[PDB]
């Protein structure tokens, strides 16, 4: 009947403090337990891989969020680097309370974990996206830790060439968390993409790298862009969408190009075989740097008869537009392609990945979807109709139909009513009018035993920013309320950030302050007990912040309009004492690249924070163990326990 | 008539700022900024737009990048000189500067190329060309240039207007001249093997090609690849970590009865340690298994007599096999349990008191339950008693610590070596048993037998190896599991992971995969000691090094490049290899891994055919008379 609870994230990162949660449950009033918790290495006797931290839990202060320090000296001396098969380690809580009171076989209760030598964050940018053979390559790296503060650990950098061989290697200390370096491309080197990797010296699994292209090129004077009127084309048998495109052709320095636009058309498959149109070629004069070309509906079906196909054979595929203009007095030419204009079946895209599974019978099922334009932005104001058919538990099936428009950025949140004793749930989701997009989904019920079920609902379906206090409601469904308290914890970036309790009431609520520690993604895992069996549920809430902790604003003032050689005052503004790494890049390099490389923005910084996220899916579970290990936790109460996962697979 | 032109009404050329600095990236600096900072800098001569990015790294507010600045430069009257990528010497090209006029005035601009040494221009370079450029339009001015020099020629193109409206621009840009001939790559592939004697040292020929341009040499690079992984498909294992957890038992009855529970409990713990399957179980099961050995170590100490002799009860006389069987176990439990070292030193002293005159071991009274002895009971009982103490004294040899028992340790190995004179005499006889040969030759290779008396028990054991199907062994038989298990521990010492041991390990894994696991005492303990030694030996690959050294003599003098490859992270290495010419190169190779060497010598080759337009064709012929100015006669 009494339990000791032990929580940790499923993957330990070495050199990083490991967040360990400990909790007493169903303990009498005048009881105080004591003990320790540490990482232990089996098969090297019981030598610890961490110094222990002591914990003390009373009956009224029955939970403690600990920070177990994981040093690299104790992790190598215990023997984890000399281990075979796979990277596995054990978190062990030691207390004589389990032996001298609960009469269990050991004074030990723990869990099985994975360990990783991947730590910190390394960001690195180059001098250029594309370089000629024989040109200097400058690169900088930036060393940070888990707390997004600059780190001082010694790193190793290497440069791999176009075939993939190490041509340069430096191991340098980080007193100021940066490293500038320069090297030269060989004069007779083949074209390709190179790879600059950075890695900590004692952290063996620190993948962080960016790539640059090597190509023979002379720098262009003007960039050619091919913009269609729509990013899609409907292949409905009754209606065909129009095929009109606009070729803006401007110089790099602003002014439009006086020239003649020469256009060829064609079709392209998934393998990469180009099939051109013999005939139907366009040759137009540029006025104000633009060329609005149009492909007629009578000319389009005539070209398919030359290729002996029809309008029903456009199920996959994409329409290929290659354009090469010539400057009408200059004699200079540049090319441009258009390779992302697919033949589609619907102008909208369905994303039901935010809709959770394994949902509680007797609770409302939260159908949350994302409506996006086809190869474009998320669209708002689109109606979504859901036909929900509940299958038979022994009675007749019943059909529900609930319609709701999309609020903002394609977010729709449709609650549908699910009763008790469901067998399965079949969904038929239709979105858009006319020509809808369809999606089918079959979700399974929990098994017919029922220890109790827990429902988590979200009243405000808006994604909050940093500073918004979000409210959530908790109701226990389907069993007798023999419990007294709910217990919750907030999971973010593969650590346990905050952990607290909340007393049980009629209509029970809790407020969670969305902090900047809680990432663009955080989890909310809450549970209780019904006797000696766990009942759990979880929920994923994303944060739409997208802002720095400090700031960095660059500004060149005035009304622009600068000549060459003039003096420019570049203004630098920041919130703290900061090292500011700068660079002024030529926009004409973006037209010379065959594949235009995408550099470093702030959106790549926020997705590096969720690389340490250990959870898969929106949350939930038909079991109470499947809630925990889909959130990324490992747990043991003494009888039920989680198995160790197999890296970040999640089938 | 229609020949209106300007004639030295033009500006001074030196009053035109010449455009010469055209980079593609600039402002590459790191500044230390205390809140606010202004950098006053100078724009380059390239007429594009600039994207200025920035990255802040503060110690208190962390990392932040900036929204980039589109900074646009514009000269309004300018000329753009886009070069070709590479032009050969004595190849006539057309330089095409294009005048650009974004003003609302009909201009008249004279354009000349400044005469630089290394270019043959039209008229020597002093001649200029006028053209009038309309308002809001652009005009090209062609120049037919042939180069002369081999390196680089900095040419300047100057465009100047009149004093009716003073316009002007000048571009100076360095032209790159390609060397004489075409490029030529030569690959000299060499499959490396420093192991055995296939390429431990070698020489490479030179390249005195008669197609070589004599001054157009390039650098020649070396690159080396060690494409040698390790295929995992040869170690399925798949022995169940649940039936081994059923073997973690508490010691129960007397001295015989304890060891059929205690010695499979230690052999389950020593298996699950060395196969590292404690993650499939809770970690409470490990600390349970320590306490089963911790209570069981000092449980047999109640049965310990006052001379190091062991029996089932205290009133029963002592047995020789059982005293060796506990000395085998408690020596391995000295790592787990910090017991008394010197009490086990007198345990082996009683076993040396029953030494025969020829080197045998004799048991005066055996144990009661002879199913604990396993496959020892037979016609060769005297051979199996002698080899089992030889296993037992070698495991107990590590308990002999410091120098206090080291003179008694000399008496241990002298009684082993006299028993090797008796076990080696029975092994060189020939006709032994199936179980009696497997326990004999494994005991010889532990205690370091002489190799003429060691290998004759190796070949006699390998003759008894009746295999069928895709299995190799010596409905489940209970007695044949122990015989295969002693032979698998011996085979890993002579040929570690061999062609037969990879398949003979897979046989008795299937024998332990039946319901109930193994069905006696000795086939449980030794086979879990055999498959634990196999699973380490099948997952221990570490082939590395590949030391390689190259050396040459010539234009550089003597120089040499040495490099080691293998840390088994990197897929290959490439270096610059600044060596001489195509002459005189010596290679010395070391290490012990498979490699692939490629030497990429690049140089300039012959000219051959021009191949001047054989697919497409274009021709143009003009006739008539054009008025000209200046020139000479």
């Amino acid at each position, epitope marked *: 009947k009494p339990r000791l609870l032990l929580f940790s994230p499923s993957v330990v990162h070495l050199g990083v403090p490991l967040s360990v949660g400990v909790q007493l449950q169903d303990v009498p009033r005048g009881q105080v337990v004591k003990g320790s918790v540490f990482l232990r290495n089996p098969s090297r006797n019981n030598v610890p891989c961490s110094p222990k931290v002591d914990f003390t839990l009373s009956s009224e202060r029955d939970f403690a969020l600990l920070s177990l320090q994981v040093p690299l000296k104790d992790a190598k001396s215990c023997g984890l680097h000399q281990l075979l098969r796979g990277p596995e380690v054990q978190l062990v809580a030691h207390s004589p309370w389990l032996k001298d009171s609960l009469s269990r076989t050991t004074n030990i209760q723990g869990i099985n974990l994975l360990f990783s030598s991947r730590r910190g964050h390394l960001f690195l940018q180059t001098d250029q996206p594309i370089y000629n053979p024989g040109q200097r390559v400058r690169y900088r790296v930036f060393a940070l830790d888990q707390k997004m503060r600059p780190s001082t650990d010694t790193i190793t950098v290497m440069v791999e060439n176009s075939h993939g061989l190490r041509v340069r290697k430096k191991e340098v200390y980080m007193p100021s968390s940066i490293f500038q370096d320069d090297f030269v491309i060989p004069d007779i080197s083949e074209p390709g993409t190179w790879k600059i990797s950075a890695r900590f010296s004692d952290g063996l699994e620190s993948n962080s790298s960016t790539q640059f292209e090597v190509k023979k090129y002379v720098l262009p004077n003007f960039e050619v862009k091919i913009t269609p009127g729509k990013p899609y084309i409907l292949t409905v048998p009754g209606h065909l969408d129009e095929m009109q495109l606009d070729i803006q052709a401007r110089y790099i320095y602003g002014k439009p190009v006086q020239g003649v636009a020469y256009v060829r058309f064609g079709l392209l498959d998934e393998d990469g075989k180009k099939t051109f149109f013999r005939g139907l070629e366009s040759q137009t004069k540029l006025v104000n740097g633009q060329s609005h070309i149009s492909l007629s509906k009578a000319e389009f079906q005539d070209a398919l008869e030359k290729l002996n196909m029809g309008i029903t054979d456009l199920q996959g595929l994409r329409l290929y537009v290659a354009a090469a203009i010539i400057e009408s007095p200059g004699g200079e030419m540049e090319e441009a392609e258009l390779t992302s204009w697919y033949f589609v079946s619907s102008p909208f895209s369905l994303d039901l990945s935010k809709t959770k599974r394994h949902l509680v019978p007797g609770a409302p099922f939260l159908l949350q979807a994302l409506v996006r334009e086809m190869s474009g932005s998320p669209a708002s104001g689109i109606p979504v109709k859901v036909s929900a058919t509940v299958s038979s538990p022994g009675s007749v099936p019943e059909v529900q139909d609930i319609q709701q428009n999309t609020d903002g950025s394609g977010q729709v949140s449709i609650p549908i009513i699910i009763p008790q004793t469901i067998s399965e749930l079949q969904l038929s989701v239709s979105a858009g009018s006319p020509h809808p997009a369809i999606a089918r989904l079959t979700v399974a019920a929990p098994p017919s035993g029922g220890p109790g079920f827990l429902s988590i609902e979200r009243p405000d379906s808006r994604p909050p920013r940093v500073g918004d206090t979000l409210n959530l409601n908790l109701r226990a469904v389907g069993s007798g309320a023999t419990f007294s308290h709910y217990y919750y914890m907030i999971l973010s970036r593969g650590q346990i950030v905050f952990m607290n309790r909340e007393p049980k009431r009629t209509l029970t609520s809790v407020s969670v302050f969305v902090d900047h520690h809680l990432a663009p993604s955080f989890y909310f895992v809450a549970f209780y007990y019904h006797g000696d069996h766990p009942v759990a549920n979880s929920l994923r809430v994303d944060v739409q912040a997208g802002a720095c902790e400090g700031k960095l604003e660059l500004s060149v003032d005035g009304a622009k309009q600068y*000549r060459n*050689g*003039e003096s420019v005052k570049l203004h630098l503004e920041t919130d703290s004492l900061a090292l500011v790494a700068l660079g002024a890049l030529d926009t004409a390099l973006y037209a010379a690249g065959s594949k235009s490389h995408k550099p470093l923005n702030m959106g790549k910084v926020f997705e590096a924070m969720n690389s340490y996220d250990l959870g898969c899916g929106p949350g939930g579970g038909d079991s109470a163990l499947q809630v925990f290990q889909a959130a990324g936790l490992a747990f043991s109460d003494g009888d039920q326990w989680t198995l160790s996962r197999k890296r970040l697979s999640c089938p | 008539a229609l020949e209106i032109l300007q004639e030295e009404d033009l500006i001074d050329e*030196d009053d035109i*700022p*010449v455009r*010469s600095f055209f980079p593609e990236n600039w402002l590459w600096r790191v500044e230390t900024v205390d809140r606010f900072q202004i950098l006053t*800098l*100078w724009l380059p001569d390239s007429l594009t737009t600039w994207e200025i990015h920035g990255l802040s790294l503060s110690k208190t507010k962390g990392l932040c990048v900036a929204t980039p600045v589109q900074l646009r430069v514009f000269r309004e009257f300018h000329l753009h000189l886009r070069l070709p990528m590479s032009v050969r010497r004595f190849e006539q090209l057309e330089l095409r500067p294009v005048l650009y006029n974004y003003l609302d005035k009909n201009l008249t601009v004279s354009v000349h190329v400044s005469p630089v040494e290394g270019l043959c221009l039209a008229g020597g370079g002093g001649l200029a060309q006028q053209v009038l450029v309309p308002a809001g339009s652009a005009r090209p001015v062609a120049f037919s240039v042939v180069p002369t020099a081999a390196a680089a020629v900095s040419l300047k193109v100057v465009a100047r207007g009149s004093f009716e409206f003073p316009v002007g621009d000048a571009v100076s840009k360095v032209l790159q001249i390609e060397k004489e001939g075409a490029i030529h790559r030569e690959e000299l592939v060499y499959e490396l093997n420093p192991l055995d004697h296939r390429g431990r040292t070698l020489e490479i020929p030179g390249n005195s090609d008669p197609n070589m341009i004599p001054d157009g040499d390039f650098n020649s690079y070396v690159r080396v690849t060690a494409s040698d992984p390790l295929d995992t498909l040869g170690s399925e294992g798949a022995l169940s970590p649940g039936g081994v957890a059923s073997l973690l038992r508490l010691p129960r009855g007397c001295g015989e009865e304890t060891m059929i529970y205690l010695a499979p409990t230690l052999a389950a713990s020593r298996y699950l340690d060395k196969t590292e399957q404690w993650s499939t179980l809770p970690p409470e099961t490990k600390d349970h298994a320590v306490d089963l050995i911790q209570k069981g170590y000092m449980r047999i100490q109640q049965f310990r007599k006052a001379d190091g002799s062991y029996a089932a009860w205290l009133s029963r006389d002592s047995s020789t096999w059982l005293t060796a069987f506990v000395l085998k176990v408690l020596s391995l439990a000295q790592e787990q349990v910090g017991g008394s070292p010197e009490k086990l030193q007198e345990t082996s002293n009683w076993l040396l008191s029953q030494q025969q005159a020829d080197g045998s071991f004799q048991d005066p009274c055996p144990v009661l339950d002879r199913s604990m002895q396993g496959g020892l009971v037979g016609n060769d009982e005297t051979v199996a008693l002698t080899a089992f103490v030889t296993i037992a004294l070698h495991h107990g040899l590590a308990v002999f610590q410091d120098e206090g028992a080291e003179p008694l340790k000399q008496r241990v190995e002298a009684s082993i070596s006299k028993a090797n004179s008796f076990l080696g005499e029975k092994a060189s006889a020939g006709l032994l048993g199936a179980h009696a040969a497997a326990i004999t030759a494994y005991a010889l290779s532990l205690t370091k037998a002489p190799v003429d008396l060691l290998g004759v028990a190796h070949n006699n054991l390998m003759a008894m190896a009746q295999e069928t199907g895709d299995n190799l062994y010596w409905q489940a038989p209970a007695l044949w599991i122990e015989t295969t298990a002693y032979a698998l521990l011996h085979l890993l010492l002579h040929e570690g992971k061999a062609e037969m041991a990879d398949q003979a390990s897979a046989w008795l894994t299937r024998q332990g995969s039946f319901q109930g696991g193994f069905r006696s005492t000795q086939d449980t303990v030794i086979a879990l000691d055999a498959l634990s030694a196999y699973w380490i030996a099948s997952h221990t690959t570490e082939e590395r090094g590949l030391n390689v050294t190259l050396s040459s003599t010539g234009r550089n003098g003597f120089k040499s490049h040495a490099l080691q490859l293998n840390n088994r992270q990197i897929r290959g290495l490439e270096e610059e290899l600044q060596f001489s010419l195509g002459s005189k190169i010596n290679v010395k190779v070391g290490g012990n891994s498979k490699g692939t060497l490629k030497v990429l010598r690049t140089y300039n080759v012959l000219d051959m055919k021009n191949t001047t337009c054989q697919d497409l064709q274009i021709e143009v012929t003009v006739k008539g008379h054009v008025e000209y100015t200046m020139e000479a006669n």
Partner: nanobody
Amino acid sequence: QVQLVESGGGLVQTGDSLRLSCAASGRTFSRYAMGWFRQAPGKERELVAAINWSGGSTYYADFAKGRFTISRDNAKNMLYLRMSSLKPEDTAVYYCAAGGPEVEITRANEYDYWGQGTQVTVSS
């Protein structure tokens, strides 16, 4: 290296004009950017004026706008400083300095080559 020689300075009264000169040896003078600095006795170096390596645009300090004029002649390898309206707080050793194209203006340490400096003393 490319070297610098200053001339033109001397004793003068308050409110007069002066023409400074900076001679430059070497051949790659058009590739480097120039700038006249000054250093008061007791204080560090500060900028007076600076001109581009091509001689296309100029930069002046906040006290030097309007009163002073910098010019470049790349055909004679000369640098001038046409000065007017002098004050007694302008008394400094006037230096002539060379730097690259990607150089900053207020940083004195980032310039490459230097001269010896000429003395301009303004009395009242």
